[PDB]
Design a protein around this ligand. Structure first.
Ligand code: SF4
Ligand code: SF4
Lengths: 532, 532
């Protein structure tokens, strides 16, 4: 009567559909042995350091085929909007620059996540986390990446760890004698667009589920640099299991799951509802960041079993910095997923805005144009993101003035990666605007932040503030951090709060920096139709 | 220089502070060996079956000391309300019944969750998931528990799996040669009160965090059978990592973490903010289900590192069916956490309502009393939960009438566990009322569901419906499923939809069933002040 049924039964559990390259000479790190009649594998733990180092280096310079194919699809589709094609062309040209192996594809080189599966008879000596962390440390220390991890000294006092550690190290015990891996360099913006909903049986019918999808996709907005890989998980044995599953689905880790359920509750991919998600995504008009058809590359929908009283649902995306690498260690050595090293093969007006003027003259020029106008910025940007905004608000709460540097120039919400030797700037694209929304009305009321520059749709309070104080929000393209650094950024200087690392206040000189007028000084918002 | 720092550094990683009992004779399942100069442990996988069977049997009849102490604190504290003391006394008497090892403490015997940590040199043969699942299968099949897992045949077509499988099996690879475990029998209601919030640096100040905590605690309501163990996690390396941590925090799995952070981003428990959570919970007035001080047993607050662009937050509770057990296998055999087998040592006015009358006469009697009135129900209840409600609405959408049996008696939202031989009923406590909110107005408009009986606060639409149609919502005490079955439930018969198992429509006869009038027929709601 008892029948064991694993929840996840991929038909390709070892990811044979993926192309791997062997690390040259890496068979010296492994030795196949036989113990008590069973095949086992001795692994020098230095293999873990070597593997993690290469994985978290390569992944910042190359992309998978299904990601690149999506950008080309947005360029070639007659139904794509002009903005769709402009964004996709820009991201692909960004990928070409990143493939030069100097500049990472995004300034947000992400959190280092390791999903590892160590076989019962795979013997590393047991210090896997230290050796994996050293390889990750090497990758972020010795390459032009970014230190993004924020340590809590107490509940509220924070500092940058200075090395992009700690990593998320999920090491599982599995059958066999191999060691299998998924490495993820997970950007903060798309990590923030991982959502958990606690729903009920009332959701589980065609009309309700379709309306639910239409509603929740809109809450993703453009804040995580679409086109998205959209993952949706219906059900699950706990909230944390639902959210792990939707993360892995967004990495296409579960693509070989069955497509039908059974009486034992096995997980399955639902291609019919993937099609509906894609139909909703396309018909939404949200587009590849600035209106159109290419809100989404593709969709993954996984249906899970559930406690009768429960229906957790997970929604998550992979962003333009779509960065994951499969790997495994076996008797022949270290194998790492082969990414596309020639993205160029996928490759098939605007208003000049002089920033080198009094800020009021820039505001006057911007006021002459409607939202949706493509602009090109030339001059000085002041760079400030989450922590700098919080420190400045705190200064003003203690009676100090809004600093002079918040009043002279557009505010670019951004944090750079490290500068390559002989380069003017490391990768330096925008951060998500919505996280600074609570500061806009306050700062504008105190004579600054009249012009902000970032990516993503913003809340109504920012539209209201810009109308009240004569402000503007400019939307940069999201994602193309390498080409912005190579072509547009000419000088970079740390202005204030240097202890914050990448979150310091910066002063940068910029030429031909593209952006769209998203919010004007009249109550208009170019996302008000598609995202409201 | 590189410095490895594990995120979690418990001072008691093997839980020496917990009392364990050895399974008698269990050293026959293990054998110490040495291979390549290293000590390894061969473990007969049968040990996993034995351990999982005992864990998921014991945990349904006994509780930890800190849970039982919380109930006694609600009885003996002069600051506890009369309802606080009444609910805590009821739950404690329920625990004494459950300690008889026949009836489980709750009808929702939960999802079977296994956190396992298999040492590198702990050799089981590798079929851990099957052997653990057989032990879980044994516990739910051969004891008076409940089959709560719902399989998806397709996106919308569902069936009960009939054995409470699949389990959630999280088997981690760790150093050493032992096998350590945390077993959790997680109720659906408290699983549903696990929430993920995507927040920002703007939250991370005392005023904002305190306001956030006050706001989110109210959204827990009474829907997961308080007094709660409240867990709050601020930060994390991903949503799924944050939600896993808040689950484990709620099981007091991380109680021995350090209490200060460092520049490497280690996790820490924050006793100052645990105190603040307890102050918010107590001052909320929500109480142990029906107004008072004992919303919470205790609090756990864990501060985690974060990507600078990210601040995931997790909030979750352990409910009155607080069910976890630690265990480990080592060279000496199988050890399992010792729970309290004599809960009685912690043990230191109502309106009679005859249900055997026309439902309209019952409504006239209830109409004479204000919300908060305690009642004792005597007569027939019609039992129907999520699936039966969805099926009946589906019938009505296809033009069929609301069935007569939905109009003759109050509707009790509940699903019983299996009936012990010679008993009138298995454990049979209430389900969460809020999940049926979308049906009340519809059913009342068609002449039924005028009186519902469940637990938890309900949404505004139910208050409006009861005022419009002369209805009432009665709140049963949440949690005391064993004593309700032993003392109050006298007869159980399946009335309709027998294929649904525990989710069929039942007709039950009841005596001295306690409840509170939560929503009356006048727009009043006894949670309108505390859960506004
Ligand atoms: S900036 Fe955009 S592309 Fe880069 S990590 Fe954030 S969401 Fe992804
Ligand atoms: S105690 Fe309440 S919330 Fe917990 S499992 Fe039982 S009915 Fe559900």
């Amino acid at each position: 009567d008892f029948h064991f049924s694993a929840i996840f039964q991929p038909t390709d559990p070892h990811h044979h559909q993926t192309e791997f390259a062997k690390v040259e000479g890496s068979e010296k790190y492994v030795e196949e042995v036989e113990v008590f009649g069973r095949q086992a594998l001795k692994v020098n733990p230095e293999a873990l350091t070597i593997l993690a180092h290469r994985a978290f280096s390569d992944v910042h310079h190359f992309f998978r085929k299904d990601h690149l194919e999506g950008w080309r699809r947005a360029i070639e589709d007659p139904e794509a909007s002009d903005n769709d094609r402009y964004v996709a062309t820009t991201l692909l040209k960004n990928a070409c620059i990143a493939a030069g192996r100097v500049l990472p594809s995004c300034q947000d080189t992400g959190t280092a996540i390791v999903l590892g599966k160590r076989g019962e008879l795979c013997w590393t000596g047991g210090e896997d986390e230290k050796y994996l962390s050293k390889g990750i440390w090497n990758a972020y220390r010795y390459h032009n990446l970014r230190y993004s991890q924020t340590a809590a000294l107490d509940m509220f006092k924070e500092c940058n760890t200075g090395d992009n550690l700690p990593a998320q190290l999920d090491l599982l015990a599995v059958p066999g004698s191999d060691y299998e891996f998924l490495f993820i360099a997970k950007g903060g913006g798309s990590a923030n667009k991982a959502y958990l909903y606690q729903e009920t049986k009332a959701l589980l019918n065609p009309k309700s589920l379709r309306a639910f999808i239409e509603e929740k996709l809109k809450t993703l907005g453009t804040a995580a640099c679409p086109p998205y890989h959209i993952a949706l998980v219906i059900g699950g044995t706990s909230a944390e299991m639902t959210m792990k599953t939707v993360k892995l689905a967004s990495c296409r880790y579960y693509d070989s799951l069955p497509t039908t359920g059974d009486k034992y509750g096995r997980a399955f991919r639902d291609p019919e509802w993937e099609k509906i998600v894609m139909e909703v995504a396309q018909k939404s008009g949200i587009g590849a960041q600035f209106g159109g058809k290419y809100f989404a590359h593709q969709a993954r929908v996984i249906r899970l079993p559930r406690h009768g009283a429960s229906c957790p649902v997970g929604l998550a995306v992979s962003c333009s910095a779509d960065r994951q690498i499969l790997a495994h260690i076996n008797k022949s050595g270290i194998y790492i997923e082969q990414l596309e090293q020639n993205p160029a093969q996928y490759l098939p007006t605007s208003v000049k805005v002089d920033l080198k003027r009094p800020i009021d003259k820039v505001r006057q020029q911007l006021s002459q144009y409607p939202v949706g106008t493509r602009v090109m910025l030339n001059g000085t940007l002041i760079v400030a993101r989450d922590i700098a905004h919080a420190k400045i608000k705190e200064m003003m709460d203690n009676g100090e003035p809004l600093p002079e540097y918040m009043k002279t120039s557009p505010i670019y919400y951004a944090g750079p990666a490290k500068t390559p030797e002989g380069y003017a700037s490391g990768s330096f694209g925008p951060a998500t605007a919505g996280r600074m929304d609570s500061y806009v009305d306050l700062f504008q009321s105190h004579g600054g932040s009249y012009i902000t520059l970032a990516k993503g749709n913003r809340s109504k309070q920012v539209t209201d503030a810009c109308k009240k104080h004569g402000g503007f929000y400019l939307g940069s393209i999201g994602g193309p951090a390498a080409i912005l650094a190579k072509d547009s950024i000419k000088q970079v200087t740390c202005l204030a709060f240097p202890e914050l690392g990448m979150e310091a206040v910066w002063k940068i000189e910029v030429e031909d920096f593209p952006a769209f007028i998203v919010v004007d000084d009249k109550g208009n918002d170019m996302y008000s139709k598609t995202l409201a």
